[PDB]
Amino acid sequence: GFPTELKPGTNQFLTTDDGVSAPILPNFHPTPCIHIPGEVRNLLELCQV
Amino acid sequence: GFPTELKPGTNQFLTTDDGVSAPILPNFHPTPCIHIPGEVRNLLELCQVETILEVNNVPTNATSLMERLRFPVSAQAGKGELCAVFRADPGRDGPWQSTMLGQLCGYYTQWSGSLEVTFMFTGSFMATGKMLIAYTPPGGPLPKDRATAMLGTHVIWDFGLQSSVTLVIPWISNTHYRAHARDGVFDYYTTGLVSIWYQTNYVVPIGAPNTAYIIALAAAQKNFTMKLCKDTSHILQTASIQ
Amino acid sequence: GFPTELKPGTNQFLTTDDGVSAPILPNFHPTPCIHIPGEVRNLLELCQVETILEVNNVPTNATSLMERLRFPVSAQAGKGELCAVFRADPGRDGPWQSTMLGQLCGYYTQWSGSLEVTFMFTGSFMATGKMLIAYTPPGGPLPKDRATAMLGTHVIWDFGLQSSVTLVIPWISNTHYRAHARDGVFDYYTTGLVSIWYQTNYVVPIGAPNTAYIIALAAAQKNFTMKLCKDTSHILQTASIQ
Amino acid sequence: GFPTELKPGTNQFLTTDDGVSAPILPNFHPTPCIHIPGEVRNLLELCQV
Amino acid sequence: ATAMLGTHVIWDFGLQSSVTLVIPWISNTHYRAHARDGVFDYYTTGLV
Amino acid sequence: DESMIETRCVLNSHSTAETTLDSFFSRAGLVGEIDLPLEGTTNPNGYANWDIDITGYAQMRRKVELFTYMRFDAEFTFVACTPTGQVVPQLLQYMFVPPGAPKPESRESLAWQTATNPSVFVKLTDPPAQVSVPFMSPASAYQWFYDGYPTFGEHKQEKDLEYGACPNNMMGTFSVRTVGSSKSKYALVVRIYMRMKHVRAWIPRPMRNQNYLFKANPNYAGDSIKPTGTSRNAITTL
Amino acid sequence: DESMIETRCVLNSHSTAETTLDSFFSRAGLVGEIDLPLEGTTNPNGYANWDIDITGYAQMRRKVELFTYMRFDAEFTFVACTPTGQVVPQLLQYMFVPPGAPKPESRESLAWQTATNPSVFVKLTDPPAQVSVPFMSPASAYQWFYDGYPTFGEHKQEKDLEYGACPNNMMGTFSVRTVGSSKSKYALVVRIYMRMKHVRAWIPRPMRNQNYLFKANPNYAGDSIKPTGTSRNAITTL
Amino acid sequence: DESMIETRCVLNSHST
Amino acid sequence: SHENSNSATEGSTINYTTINYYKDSYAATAGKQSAAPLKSPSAEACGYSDRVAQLTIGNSTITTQAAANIIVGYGEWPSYCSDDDATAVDKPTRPDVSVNRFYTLDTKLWEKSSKGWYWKFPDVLTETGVFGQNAQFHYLYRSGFCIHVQCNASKFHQGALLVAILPEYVIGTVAGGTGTEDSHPPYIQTQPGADGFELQHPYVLDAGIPISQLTVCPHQWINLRTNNCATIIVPYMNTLPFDSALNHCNFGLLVVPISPLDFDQGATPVIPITITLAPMCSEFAGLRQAVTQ
Amino acid sequence: SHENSNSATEGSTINYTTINYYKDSYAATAGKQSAAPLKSPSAEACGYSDRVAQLTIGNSTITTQAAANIIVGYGEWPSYCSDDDATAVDKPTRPDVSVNRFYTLDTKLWEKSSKGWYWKFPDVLTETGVFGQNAQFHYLYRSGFCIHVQCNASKFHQGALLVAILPEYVIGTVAGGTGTEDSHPPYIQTQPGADGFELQHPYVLDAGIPISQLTVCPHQWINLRTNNCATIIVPYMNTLPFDSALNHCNFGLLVVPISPLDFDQGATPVIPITITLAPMCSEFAGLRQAVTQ
Ligand SMILES: CCCCCCCCCCCCC/C=C/[C@H](O)[C@H](N)CO
Ligand SMILES: CCCCCCCCCCCCC/C=C/[C@H](O)[C@H](N)CO
């Protein structure tokens, strides 16, 4: 085994942690995204309305 | 030790997780793969094979179970009589469960694409006539007459001249994919209704049988696709296998 | 910490797992490897060495245990008499367990390739005659006469002129590999039967012994291969070693 | 998380294991090594005396 | 079952009204004399 | 399609990747449940010898019996637990026993030394033990349907159970123990889950429309032959 | 082969890789079981000194005694457990004691300070402790069969036990303790598993066809000399 | 002839 | 290069991208994948019309519709075993005229209440002709098959037969009816020989598998108005290059009336179904004394 | 480069691809591996016919069949220790004519009930000749051997001997018969000298190993109809470059009748087996006073 050392913070669940997770479905491709009007990319777009 | 941090999801066993596992046998090479005919690389290859559609799923007794594969056609009064109806949903409980497309559809939540239903006439060579096989898009109920049914997608099938016709059920849906149509809210995903009507009649001369049968063979087209692999529910074993 | 996720199989100890382990001794260099003769790099090298095949595995007493390595040949009535039979299965319980090929075969589930069985005549130089050593492919039972046996793969062995012959048991199998043939369902993996028949006789003049012996030496060919390493069952120690 | 598998030997403390360990002091540089006479680099130097 | 072990044709007479069973020249000799009841049955062509 | 209706151009970017065998079969499912009870007569000695056979549970068996021949490697996951669901501090020794290797006769059997047998030592507090199992068969594929007998000779009714038994598929025993000289203080249940990786399948059969009754056996209830699908009152109505 | 029968061309792509010594021997098997009981007289003090010898269990011993000389590195795995199978929260100190190093005389012995000895501290709740052990022997290979004596001088019956004792093979003691001044509250069993990596073997011997009785000893039961294989009633029948 | 059985090459030097 | 090439998909034509952290390729993840045989293709669809222009093999000749009505099983013509695919070092015998010929088995009568029959291959030919003698004499066997099921009826008769080829047609039992007996089919049921065996439950094919999905197997219809015969070209389908012809059947030929036979009184009530079949590319190896079973 | 080259397979000719995460190469995985010596090759098979054209060594000469009947043990000729393989810094003595010569030990009689004998090397020659004197005087010894077992019989005699060379022939006991005594063989049994020791249980070779697999060791048959002698060329086989000649035996020579001696009354009942053997490339080092044991 490659020598590793667990730091503080293992087995913690940070709700805003942007981590990799095990996919429940191998090779599942979703429904292709059709063009839907109105698309929002930033909440400041809503703030400016 | 290299500084690492365990995330949520460690020591979990996801059954569909495509992960690396410790090999029980170092340097074990398997038996070389000889050429075996018939090889399948995709389940949609099985979906495209035509399988007998059990339109006549009326009889339940074991002595009359083989009668489900065919449905009768006979001489009528020439008023555009109704021969047989069935829903065009492959994953729905009913006639389509007898097909390979239906049984494979039980393993997938969402399906899309056109469907091939081939009706093979199994009467005499003297037996002649035409049938109106109408596919009703969703929204239209069961037609009360052939005049109602011909407004939908339909084929007029001279079974006397050509013994086999294929009604291509076109992919007509609001959604890009259809889930399993069910009695209730999930009837939103109905494919529609397929009904067979006597275009003229079943005409036979003296010496030919007055009743013939049609073997419906259902398949899928090359545009058929599947999504969201799931446990099948077309058959449920409630007892433990000894 | 680098985001990691433990899969199923952590904290498991797979005994055949080829993994990295923490070295108890940093910078410990071992004793330099001098040249030692005889070095083995593959167990199939041991499989190809000819070892005494105990065809005459009749006697059980310790005083007559050395008689198992040879089997008698003597003057007969000249009717194609039966000398000795044995199964051609190296991993099977019986005559082949005395061989190195048989004992190594206990450590491997599946074997493939041809087998070399060498019969060495150990009579007088005046002792002469021929033997029909027939290998029966599977399906054929024990031949009741030499006429039945000669229909299979056979050698006619003048032991008077050449003291040693080798019956090459050819790899004749439905499967690419053979598991251990067993009494029961696993007799599907039988190699067949090898039987020795008097082609003419055992002929000796006055002063030569009337009974001689043949030492069967079994081996494997260069095409012999092995698969699926397993615990041996040719010998089972049921007591603890003190 | 990157798929990993613990082997036999985790949470073991091998006393002669030459492994990496967490430093108690970030950016602590030691006292510079002055030249001290007599330096030994191998115990066989002591063996030859 | 005995007969199908020899040279045979399976003839759908409903679909094709005429079939031809080619009796192949299967003989020990290069030429056949007249087959007769007796010794000269050596020159039999066989049975159809 | 265009031979039936007038069609519009549809750019169908619909993926077929989820209908591959490596998508249909690479999902772990229950193929064996092993009980190690404290007072029951099933495995009272703390050890169990389970012959490897995935045809004991209807879902996986029907999935693999869709095809006749099926060559694959397998990810074997063993979820050991207390049959009340507890995670007890108990250490188990799984050990793959290949055909011909000695199947253990006791918990403290000498075959547990696993000098050549592949064995897994894992505690119940650990995550389920996962191992990759390669393609075992001496054949070129596994064979869920063997139309014939393994052995030659006359086949009477007493040996009719050998019909369908292809020893290219019975590839040994999965042996599980509680590692100790004394009996464990917990009841253990080991649940075996197989995920099929690198899957090749050759001959598709009709699916299973009858209730499975026996392992490695297409036997069906004769008096309970039900139709493949649901029934209808009449054919002119839905 | 072609000197016996007419042969067809067979493209035999049959792998020989699984018959290598690194395939035959690189599978971990039981070479030592150490008991640390609570009331027994075997190791009542919570410590045990086990001289390293793999010839105590028949499977590994017969596998390695197929050859005479055998130079390898070893992956040593110690599966500590309660002999009822429990995984108790107990911390143990394994410690390799090389020849000449002080073998501990007690659980709280001063040799446990392991300032130079290789030692492993591992709890039972942890997975089994795994360590790579290099090639120890002052010789160029380990020697399961030493036809001779280690020492010179006259060899009487009192020193006949030295026959076959090659000190190129007895490479020290594996010492295990429960780390504490007080006696542990659990009975412990440590099972040692050796996986042989980087294996070279030189002189193949006849296999072991008699029951093993004593470690590092080819002794066999004289009145129980059984044949190498099974017996037959007659030679003209199967 | 070859529409009936698999045939071997026979050099029929038979005079007419 | 650093990994053993010992996965189950080595030798395939599919490139797999995989994640592996171990020495063995089978330890890797399933990964990504970086006319049609299953629809019972005709000889015209497979492009094998040259071999089909006259179905004459050995010393036999059948007559039927060409190309379009010749179902090649799984789109593959029968062939001799390739050098790499074979394992047995003994060279096989290829009689090729005494074994590759049409054998006519029996004349089972189609009735209005007929349920269907099955024939196991090469069990039907184990005791018939030089093919049967080679099957008994040799341990190893390998052959394709050209099965030509013949059922002639007048143009006033009606009915259809699902003439289908089910590979590894394992026979199940009724299990005592209740399903709690674990009965096994006898030798006359598993291997009924050239006479065949009538199906007890053709709906489940005596195996618990519906006949409605039997068409995924190589098959052809004998719908009497269209055709009077079905020709199925079956290759050798097995996990092995060779197998015993006596204790393993490669496939079962299912001839089941899906649409019942029907005709008015006055026509011929004897409508027989004839099974004529030819081994193709037949190989035999492992020669010993002849054993029937 | 960054790892210690301290694995057990450094110095070998096999390239190993390995996975290592530590400083030491022995911590790595077993990995992949990126005439024939074991079949008792003849001198013709090893290509050593030039050294065999006349078996004359030192001041002795034996006569036998050449090349084909000269078994080179493990396909390796005896040689002096190479500079790298040797550890002792003292330079060895090479007498080469007074020690490399054929020594004739004894004349053990083959009987019809004979069980077999073994000879331990160089224990048989520790008290014989200049070789014996060099063995007593020097701590370190290294030599190959040319053992020529001679057993002459008439062409009316029958029988065979497995003349075999078992390296490190450790003698086991009967352990009291029941197997619960842990007895050890005495010095006259472990090292019987030039007289040899008769086997008590030749089936298990007095070590619990079957004689049926003794042929994996260097061996030759003395089947009386074919040959009257066996010549085995044994190299120095040890874990060490040198060893003591007095308390360690490199190998045991097994001469066991597999086929019993048999002849009718009137022929000579005295059929003796003569052990003639020559050390080859004999080296002695570590010189001190002579010690017998
Ligand atoms: C350390 C534990 C390793 C576990 C090894 C399990 C072996 C996996 C073999 C899977 C191959 C199929 C097993 C059996 C097939 C079927 O159930 C029947 N025998 C065929 O009807
Ligand atoms: C921290 C624990 C490290 C454990 C170290 C164990 C040392 C491994 C040495 C293995 C070499 C062989 C051991 C003994 C060989 C045989 O059993 C006999 N002595 C020879 O008959």
Residue numbers in the entry:
A (entry chain B), D (entry chain B): 1 to 49
B (entry chain B), C (entry chain B): 1 to 242
E (entry chain B): 147 to 194
F (entry chain C), G (entry chain C): 60 to 297
H (entry chain C): 60 to 75
I (entry chain A), J (entry chain A): 12 to 45, 65 to 323
Task: Show me the paper's own sentences about this structure.
Enteroviruses (EVs) comprise a large genus of positive sense RNA viruses of the family Picornaviridae and are jointly responsible for a range of serious diseases of both domestic livestock and humans. EV virions are non-enveloped ~30 nm icosahedral particles assembled from pentameric subunits comprising three structural proteins, VP0, VP1, VP3, surrounding the ~7.5 kb genome. In enteroviruses (EVs), cleavage of the structural protein VP0 into VP4 and VP2 is initiated by the incorporation of RNA into the assembling virion and is essential for infectivity. The resulting structural proteins VP0, VP3 and VP1 assemble into protomers, five of these assemble into pentamers, twelve of which assemble into icosahedral particles in the presence of a nascent VPg-coupled genome. These transient intermediate particles have been termed provirions, comprising the full complement of structural proteins encapsidating the RNA genome.
High-resolution structures of the E096A mutant EC and provirion were generated from the same dataset, exploiting the capacity of cryoEM to separate different particles within a mixed population. Initial maps showed one class containing 2739 particles (~31%) which were likely to be native conformation ECs, with no evidence of internal density corresponding to genome. After several cycles of refinement (3D auto-refinement, post processing, CTF refinement, and Bayesian polishing) the native ECs were resolved to 2.5 Å and the genome-containing provirion resolved to 2.7 Å using the gold-standard FSC (0.143). Similar to the PV native EC structure, the VP0 cleavage boundary was modelled to the same position, where the boundary interacts with a well conserved, and putatively catalytic histidine residue at the N-terminal end of the VP2 F-strand. Along with this conserved localisation, we also observed the same unusual φ and ψ angles around this site, with the carbonyl oxygens of the P1 and P1’ residues roughly facing the same direction, toward the VP2/VP3 intra-protomer interface. Unlike the PV and HRVC native EC structures, which resolved 13 and 8 residues at the N-terminal end of the scissile boundary, respectively, the E096A EC model was resolved for 5 residues upstream of the scissile site. However, while both PV and HRVC models showed discontinuous density leading to the VP0 A1 β-sheet, our native EC map allowed all residues between the scissile site and the VP0 A1 β-sheet to be modelled. After final refinements were performed, the native EC and provirion models were compared and yielded an rmsd value of 0.220 Å, suggesting that there was minimal conformational change induced by genome packaging in the presence of the E096A mutation.
